[PDB]
C-alpha cells in the first residue's frame, strides 16, 4: 500500500483522484513487483502488446521520456506523471511530452533524422499489424470504392449510364 | 499518299483538319508500312514507350477498342477515329471509349473483375516507372512534409515553439 502523504502529493501533482492513484500503484506493483522498472522490462511489456513486431527502439525512446531524472529506472512517481500528462493533459503538455519523445539526444531540438528514427521505431513495432496511411488508397481499394459507388443497383455490373453518371 | 475523297470523308467523320489527317496517315505508314497493324505490332509499339514493363495485357485491351470491326487488324480509318475521340472528343465520347476499354468481353457491362484486370494491366506496364497514388503519402514523404512545414527558419532543427505552432 501507499502512505497517505505520498497519495496526497501525487494526487496534487497529477490529474488523478486519490483512488485512481492507488489503483495505478496496485497495477504498477502487480506487473513490476520490485517497485522499479528498467528498460528491459519496459521493452518486454511493449512486446506483450505487439508480439509480431520489434518494440525495442520505440520502447527505448518512450522509456527515455518516462525516466524524467535519467537514472535508468522508472519509479512510480515518474510512472504516474507520464500517464497523467499523456492521457489527461492539456494540448500544450501533451505536445511538450511528444517533443521530448522526438528529441532523442535531449539537446532541445528535433532533427530530421531524429523524427525519421521515431517513425522507423513505430513501424518496426506496429508496421505489420496496424493499417498504415500509405495503404488507404491501394489499387484494389480504389477499384472497390469506384465500383461500389458506380454500381447504383448493386447487381455487380456497370451499365454505360452507371459508368457515365458515376464518372461525374 | 491518300486520295482526296478519302481525306474528305475522314476529315468529315473526325475532329481533324485535312492537313492533320494527311500528317497522321504519313505517320501511320511510316511506323506501319503494310498499312495494317495487328496486335503484335501494337504491343511492340507500347513496348517502346514502356521498355521496363510488360505492356502485353494493356496493349491487347486497347487494341480491342481500336479494332472497331473486330477483324484482327487496325486499318487507318480505325486508327484515326480512335485518336480523334480519345484526344478531341466530348466527355461523353471519351467516356464511351473508356467504357469499351473496360468492357473486356464486349457484353455491354463492366464487372468488378474486368475493372480489376484493367488496373492490373496498367500496373504491369507502368507500375515500376510512374508515380502511383499509394506512394504519395509514404512514411518518409510524410516526415519531410511535416518537418519542412514546421521548420520555419529552415535551420534543419525544430524548437519546441516551432513544433507546437507547427502542430496546429
Ligand atoms: C488503458 C490502461 O493502460 C494504459 N492507460 C494509459 C494511459 C496513458 C499511457 C499509457 C501508456 O501506454 O503508457 C506507456 C506504456 O505503454 C506500455 O505498454 O507500458 C507503458 C508504461 C497507458 N496505458 C497502457 C499501460 C501499459 C502498461 C503499464 C504498466 C507498465 C509497467 C508496470 C505496470 C503497468 C500497469 N499498471 O496497471 C496496468 O494495468 N499496467 C501501464 C499502462
Ligand atoms: C503525341 C503524339 O502521339 C499520340 N497522340 C495521341 C492522341 C491520342 C491517343 C494516342 C495513343 O496513345 O493512342 C493509342 C496508341 O498508343 C501507342 O503507343 O500506339 C497507339 C496507336 C496518341 N499518341 C500516341 C501514338 C503512338 C503511336 C501511334 C502509331 C501507332 C501505329 C502506327 C503509327 C503510329 C504513329 N503515327 O504517327 C506517329 O507519330 N506514330 C500513334 C499515336
Ligand atoms: Ca527515474
Ligand atoms: Ca535532438
Ligand atoms: Ca449496376
Ligand atoms: Ca479492324
Ligand atoms: Ca463485360
Ligand atoms: Ca527551426
Residue numbers in the entry:
A (entry chain B), B (entry chain B): 7 to 174
Sentences from the paper on this structure:
NCS-1 is a high-affinity calcium binding protein that plays diverse roles in the nervous system, including synaptic transmission and plasticity, due to its ability to interact and regulate multiple protein targets. At the molecular level, NCS-1 contains two pairs of EF-hands and a C-terminal dynamic helical region that inserts into a surface exposed hydrophobic groove and acts as a ligand mimic in the absence of a binding partner. Neuronal calcium sensor 1 (NCS-1) interacts with D2R in a Ca2+-dependent manner. Crystallographic and biophysical data revealed that these molecules bind to the both spacious and conformationally adaptable hydrophobic crevice of NCS-1, overlapping with the D2R recognition site and thus competing with D2R for NCS-1 binding.
Crystals were obtained for full-length NCS-1 in complex with ATV and NCS-1ΔH10 in complex with AZS and VLZ (see Experimental Section). The asymmetric unit contained a single molecule of NCS-1ΔH10. However, the 2Fo-Fc and the Fo-Fc electron density maps revealed domain swapping between EF-hand motifs, with two NCS-1 molecules exchanging their EF-hand EF-4. The resulting NCS-1 structure, comprising EF-hands 1 to 3 from one molecule and EF-hand 4 from a second molecule, closely resembles the canonical monomeric conformation in which EF-hands pair in a two-by-two arrangement without domain swapping. A single molecule of AZS was bound to NCS-1, occupying the upper region of the protein’s hydrophobic cavity. The interface between AZS and NCS-1 spans a contact area of 468.8 Å2, comprising 490 interactions, predominantly mediated by van der Waals forces. Ligand recognition involves 15 NCS-1 residues located within EF-hand 1 (helices H2 and H3) and EF-hand 2 (helices H4 and H5). The carbonyl oxygen of the AZS ester moiety forms a direct hydrogen bond with Y52, positioned at the base of the cavity. Notably, all aromatic moieties of AZS, including the benzimidazole, two phenyl rings, oxadiazole, and dioxolane, engage in π-π stacking with surrounding aromatic residues. Azilsartan medoxomil binds to the upper region of the NCS-1 crevice, and molecular dynamics simulations suggest that its binding does not interfere with the insertion of the dynamic helix H10 into the lower part of the crevice.
